[PDB]
C-alpha cells in the first residue's frame, strides 16, 4: 500500500532459477504499491570479511582488536565503512526483508553470512538488554526463500539428511528472531534442477500469489522472551514456574527449546494460529 | 607419522583462538605428528565460489552452474590453484582440527567460503558415497569453538536452546556428509570474562587431550545403511528399520529424532 521491502540475494548468475524469483518477487510487490531495494550482493561485489577496515575513524585499542566492541562505537560515532551504512540504511527502511538463496552446506552461502556479519552490528540489531521477541526489528517482518539440489524425501523426518525444522533453526531463531523479526513461514524449493519447465513456472507464480497477501501472515512460533530470567545471575534460564506448567506437556516449545521432549511438528516450517 | 590439518579463522593474533592453534600444533608436534596449517585470514583466502575458479574451458558460459563445471574441473585439472593446494593438505591429512569463534550460531564467512570452494564434489563426495561411505571416512575431525555467552544460555533451558542443535548442520551435514569421523567439539563458553590464568589452564586442557585425541570414540550419527541409498526411493529410512523403530522412546540423533526425544548430548558427547 505504501511499504517497503528489501529483497537479499546471494547468487551469481542471472541465468539462475533465484534470479528468476528475486524478479518474480519485486514484480509481484511492485504491482501491490510496495517500495523494492534490492542488495544483489554479487553484483555488488559485497566484501564479506569482517576486519579493521570496517572502521574508518580511530581503534579504541588496536593493540588488542575486539571486532564486536569497536564496531559499535564505529556505528555510534559514525565511522563504519560507508558499505555496511548503505545496507543499515536499507534495513531501518524495510518493513519486510526476503533472503533468496540456494543452500549451500546446509546453510547460507558464505557472502550472505558475511553479509549478517558485517551488517548486523551490536546496538544497531541486537543489544544483550533486546533480544529475541524485544529486539529491535520487532516491527519487521522477514522471510526466507530457499532452493535445493536434493528432493523434499531427503529432508523429511525419515530422510537420509534429516529433518529440514532443524537445518533453518540456527537461520531463523539464532539470526533472525535474534534481532526482532517476525520470521514468516519460510518457502522451500526442492529439487530445482530436477524439476520439468511447466512446474517451475507454477512455482514462480504461487510465490507471486503468496506475496500479495504476505504481511497478512501468521509468524512461526518462537518462545517469548518473558518465559525466561534475563539477567546474568540467572544464567539466562527459563523461570521455574514456566518449567513447572510445562513439566506435564508432551510436546516442547520449539526446535531449539525441545526440553528433551518431542519437538512441534514443522515448528520451523509452518506456523500455528 | 601420522599427518594433521588445522584450520583457524580468527583474524587477530592476539587471540585465545589463535592461541588455542598454537597450543595445538606445539602438542601435536611433541607426540610426533606432522603439522600443516591453512591460517584463512593470514592467507588472504577468497571465500566466494565464482567463474574465477575454473582456469580451463566452461561447458557451457551461457547457463553456468558451479557444481556442474567445478566438478569438470577437478577431473580435468583446471582449478584454480588456491584451491587445489587446499585439496593437497587434506588429501594428506589423518585428522583435521578447526579451530573457530562461534559468530551468528555458525562458522565465520571466510570458514564458510572455505568449504564451498574446496569440498568440491567427487573429491569430497559424490551421490554413491555419502555419509559413512564418503571418502574422508578414514579421517577424523574435531570442531573447537569459542562463545562470548555463558554454558546455561545453550542448555536445553536457556534462552539460545540446545547447542547439540547449532552444531548439528555443520557436524552432520558438513563433515560426516563427506566421510568424516566427528569427535566431541572443544567447547569454550564465555571467554571473555576469563581471565588470563584461567584460559592458560584451558589451554593445558586442550594440549592434554590431544596426546590421546585418536583413540576416543566418535559421535553417534544413523548408518547410511538404515537407508534405501537411491532416487526411486527417495533417500528414504528403509520401512523394516521404521518397524523396528516405533516403539523406542528416543530418536537417533538430532537431526533423526523422528518426532521423538533426542539422545542427550548426541552431538557433543560419544556413547
Ligand atoms: C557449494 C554448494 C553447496 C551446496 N549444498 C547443497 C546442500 O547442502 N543441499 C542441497 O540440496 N543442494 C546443495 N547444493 C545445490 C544447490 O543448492 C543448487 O544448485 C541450487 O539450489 C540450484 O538453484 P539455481 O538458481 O542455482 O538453479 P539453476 O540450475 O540455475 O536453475 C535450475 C533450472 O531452472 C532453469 N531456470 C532459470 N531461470 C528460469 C526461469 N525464469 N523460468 C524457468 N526455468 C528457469 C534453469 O535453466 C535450470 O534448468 C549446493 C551447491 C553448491 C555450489
Ligand atoms: C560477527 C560476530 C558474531 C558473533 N556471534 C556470536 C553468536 O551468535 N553467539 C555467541 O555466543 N558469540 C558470538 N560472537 C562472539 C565471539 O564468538 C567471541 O567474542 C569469541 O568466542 C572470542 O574469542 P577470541 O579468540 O576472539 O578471543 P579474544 O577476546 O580476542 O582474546 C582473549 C584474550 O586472551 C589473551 N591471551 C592471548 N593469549 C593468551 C594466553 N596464552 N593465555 C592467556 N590469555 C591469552 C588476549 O591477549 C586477549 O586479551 C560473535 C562475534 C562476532 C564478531
Redesign the interface.
Known sequence: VGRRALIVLAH??R?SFNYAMKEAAAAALKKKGWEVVESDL?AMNFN?????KDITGKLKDP???Q??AESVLAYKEGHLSPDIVAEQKKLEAADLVIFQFPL????????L??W??RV?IGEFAYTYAA??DKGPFRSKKAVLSITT???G??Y????????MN??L???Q???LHFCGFQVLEPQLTYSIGHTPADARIQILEGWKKRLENIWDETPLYFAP?SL?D?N?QA????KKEV?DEEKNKKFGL??????????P?DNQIKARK
Not at 564479506?48 to 579493521?52: N, Y
Open positions: 551469481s548468475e541465468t554479487y564479506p570479511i569482517i576486519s579493521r593493540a588488542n582488536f571486532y564486536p549451500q552446506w546446509f546453510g547460507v552461502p558464505a557472502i553470512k558475511g549478517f556479519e548486523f533480544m529475541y539440489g536434493g528432493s524425501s531427503m523429511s523426518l525419515q530422510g537420509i539428511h534429516g529433518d532443524v537445518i533453526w540456527p537461520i531463531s539464532g539470526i522472551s525466561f534475563l546474568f544464567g539466562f534460564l527459563m518449567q520449539s526446535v531449539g527449546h525441545h526440553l528433551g521432549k518431542s519437538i511438528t
